[PDB]
């Protein structure tokens, strides 16, 4: 998951665990009218890098498997990424995030129970990677913003950094899409002018109703608008095109700083299912870890060191 030159035989340590794979309702609305509906299995992944007793950075990723008879639509959603910045930065963060995220994308050792012993997934997978960039001061680590070595990027800088990461781990993929809702074509194109495989737009179905095309991911700027469309029972009228048009005027985008949406796809990848023993936990155990995290003052080495010792 990480190369020796980073971990350095125990100078750095990792926290990494998954939830037990859990069936959920599809994050994309599938009419009960549809033929051969998929089962949806969700896995949460949490990764942190440690340096001695301190957290250096964290990454939370959700994987959604839409399981059809003959193939899987596999969505990989980057939920959160953050840094602590209590110590002067030793590694380039992208050199950690890329490989970890690539490991999560390609991970195929999930132990999925049968739908009411373990289910065998189809060998054909269509990958979809979905990331948004929005320059918050603190995604995972409360009060880290006024740490001395936390490097806070503005929106354009954050976007450039994520395009670089994602490009590096999606070599050969079928498409790479960037949308900056509310920006003109020229401004968006400048971010990807040096990336031959990238183009403006999104990865989802282009026509029809938005809720039947766009996944509703938790704590996603896109998802929050989708949520509104659904709660106001406008799901039956809102098109994909009009959704992306109106997204641009939401407060989060229009008042935001280069808030951007990235999606990449790889079609018809033949995968082999490959046991890889990692720590797996109940959703309650996961949520309990995350709730503890929320209560740590990450400007306080004592509290961070305590949090880490407790996890051990």
From Swiss-Prot:
Transmembrane segments: none annotated. The modification N6-acetyllysine is found at residue 222. InterPro entries: HAT_RTT109-like, Histone_AcTrfase_Rtt109/CBP, Rtt109. Signal peptide: none annotated. One of its GO terms (molecular function) is histone H3 acetyltransferase activity. Its EC number is 2.3.1.48. It comes from the Eukaryota. Residues 1-312 form the Rtt109-type HAT domain. GO terms for cellular component: nucleus. The keyword Transcription applies. The active site is at residue 220. Keywords: Acetylation, DNA damage, Nucleus, Transcription, Transcription regulation, Transferase, Virulence. It is found in: Nucleus. Acetyl-CoA binds at residues 132, 136, 151-153, 161. Belongs to the RTT109 family. This is Histone acetyltransferase RTT109. The gene is RTT109.
């Amino acid at each position: 998951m990480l190369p020796p030159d980073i971990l350095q035989n125990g100078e750095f340590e990792t926290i990494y665990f998954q939830t037990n794979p859990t069936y959920i309702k599809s994050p994309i609305h599938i009419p009960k009218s549809t033929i051969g509906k998929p089962d949806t299995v969700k896995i949460r992944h949490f990764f942190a890098l440690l340096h001695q007793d301190l957290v250096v950075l964290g990454l939370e990723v959700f994987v959604y498997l839409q399981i059809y008879s003959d193939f899987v639509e596999k969505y990989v959603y980057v939920s959160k990424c953050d840094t602590v910045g209590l110590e002067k930065s030793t590694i380039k963060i992208g050199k950690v995030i890329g490989p970890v995220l690539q490991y999560i994308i390609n991970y195929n050792g999930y132990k999925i129970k049968m739908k009411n012993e373990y289910r065998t997934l189809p060998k054909t997978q269509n990958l979809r990677l979905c990331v948004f960039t929005k320059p918050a001061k603190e995604y995972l680590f409360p009060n880290s913003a006024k740490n001395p070595y936390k490097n806070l990027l503005n929106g354009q800088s954050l976007l450039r950094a994520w395009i670089s990461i994602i490009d590096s781990i999606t070599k050969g993929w079928n498409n790479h899409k960037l949308m900056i809702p509310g920006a003109d074509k020229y401004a968006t194109r400048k971010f990807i002018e040096k990336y031959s495989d990238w183009s403006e737009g999104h990865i989802f179905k282009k026509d029809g109703l938005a809720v039947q095309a766009i996944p509703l991911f938790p704590d996603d700027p896109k998802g929050r608008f989708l949520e509104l469309v659904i709660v106001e029972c406008r799901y039956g009228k809102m098109t994909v095109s009009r959704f992306y048009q109106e997204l641009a005027y939401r407060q989060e985008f229009l008042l935001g700083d280069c808030v951007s949406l990235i999606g990449c796809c790889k079609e018809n990848l033949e995968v082999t299912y490959h046991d890889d023993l990692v720590s797996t936990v109940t959703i309650s155990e996961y949520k309990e870890f995350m709730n503890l995290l929320k209560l740590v003052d990450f400007s306080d080495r004592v509290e961070v060191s305590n949090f880490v010792s407790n996890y051990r």
